[PDB]
Structure 1
Amino acid sequence: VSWISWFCGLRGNEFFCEVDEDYIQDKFNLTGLNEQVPHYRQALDMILDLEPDEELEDNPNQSDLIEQAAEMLYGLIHARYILTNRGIAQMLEKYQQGDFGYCPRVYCENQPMLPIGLSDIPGEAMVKLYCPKCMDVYTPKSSRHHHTDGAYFGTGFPHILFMVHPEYRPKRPANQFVPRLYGFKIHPMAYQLQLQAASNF
């Protein structure tokens, strides 16, 4: 059992995809992350299936500041990885399976969504879900994914996916929700009057 396959197989990490072998082995794609994640080589060698500190007291102690610092690294690497043609193809495959879920909106008709972060900065916002049909972001259904940084997915992943694959852009909704009270439509003035009444406390 490897590290990458183990992590992505965990509960709450169904959004993650397994990063290819040579993408991490290629040090060209990992620059600028040295003073961005604590214990760089520790975070690197752990996810790269390498031996731990050979002589430094192997006793993990609280490796929560190391192992969960290795999770931080792989997360940021995953962000750069799902922008590449290989990474997109993997996400697009999970997209076909529906690993990310379906749109909550009724008139999107269970359109499968893509993972997305509101910010590319870690610890600022959690992972969200982007429906390509209604083109808006939503909060994940299950509480599992409510503890995953959105910076591990980026802000332009679903956007760049349809840039290289425009054929997957869903047809805009054929129907929409129309308010019906006793068979009557509702004039937009109604909502304007209610807002004015709401601004009176």
Structure 2
Amino acid sequence: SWISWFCGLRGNEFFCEVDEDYIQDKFNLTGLNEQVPHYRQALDMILDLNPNQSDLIEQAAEMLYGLIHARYILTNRGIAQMLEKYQQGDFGYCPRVYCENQPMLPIGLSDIPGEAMVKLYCPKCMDVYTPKSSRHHHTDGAYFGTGFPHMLFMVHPEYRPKRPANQFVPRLYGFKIHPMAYQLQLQAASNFKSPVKTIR
């Protein structure tokens, strides 16, 4: 099948296998015809149903599946499937030290394709991070949505991790840096990087 192969490819670890059950009901695929070119022939390649066109149709099927994915992973079933991957840490671990390697969730900064690549949401610190592995630096963010992880914890509130136990305390010979001292520091950088005279 096409679905199982695509999700099994190198770089597509973040994806879950969308049930054909969901894709055959055309209720769910609304508006997607006006989003991708060659929609009918791209949908055919997904359900397993001339070197000019057959190349472009493969790319349009990749863009279709991904948009469908963004909708699918918001559903209770799509949530449960990602939640399974999340429990095995398929989405990487948080680089923040005081998050203690919290498992992450994929997220898109934008919903429209071509604008941003995929990013990682940490349930603990609640900030977003660029995937550490440079094999994921080509997955379009639009395929996971802006709302996926937020929807997840709304459906399963139980899965929120408690706020970080500890915090980073900068110490210089064990004296803490007073915040008066960054306000200063931040000028000296402004006042510094100033237009050097451009000789006439």
TM bracket (short chain): over 0.9
* Structure 1 unaligned regions, length at least 5: 50-58
TM-score by length of 1: 0.93
**Corresponding residue pairs, total:** 191
* Structure 2 unaligned regions, length at least 5: 193-200
Distance 1:93 1:17 in 2: 10
SS at match of 1:144: coil
Distance 2:80 2:86 in 1: 9
- How much is the aligned-residue C-alpha RMSD, in angstroms? 0.8
Distance 1:15 1:118 in 2: 16
**Residue in 2 that maps onto 1:146:** 137
Shift, 1:183, TM fit: 1.3
Shift, 1:42, TM fit: 1.1
Shift, 1:196, TM fit: 1.0
> Which of 70, 83, 92 is equivalent to 2:83?
92
Distance 1:30 1:153 in 2: 16
**Residue in 1 that maps onto 2:123:** 132
Shift, 1:62, TM fit: 5.3
Deviations 1:120-146 (A, max 9, x none): 000000000000000000000001110
**% same residue:** 99
SS at match of 2:185: helix
Distance 2:54 2:117 in 1: 23
Distance 1:99 1:130 in 2: 13
Instruction: Return 63-72 or 81-90, whichever deviates more.
Output: 63-72
Distance 2:35 2:53 in 1: 21
Distance 2:162 2:115 in 1: 33
Deviations 1:50-101 (A, max 9, x none): xxxxxxxxx3435332101100000000000000000000000000010000
Deviations 1:6-64 (A, max 9, x none): 00000100000000021100000001011210100111000111xxxxxxxxx343533
TM-score by length of 2: 0.94
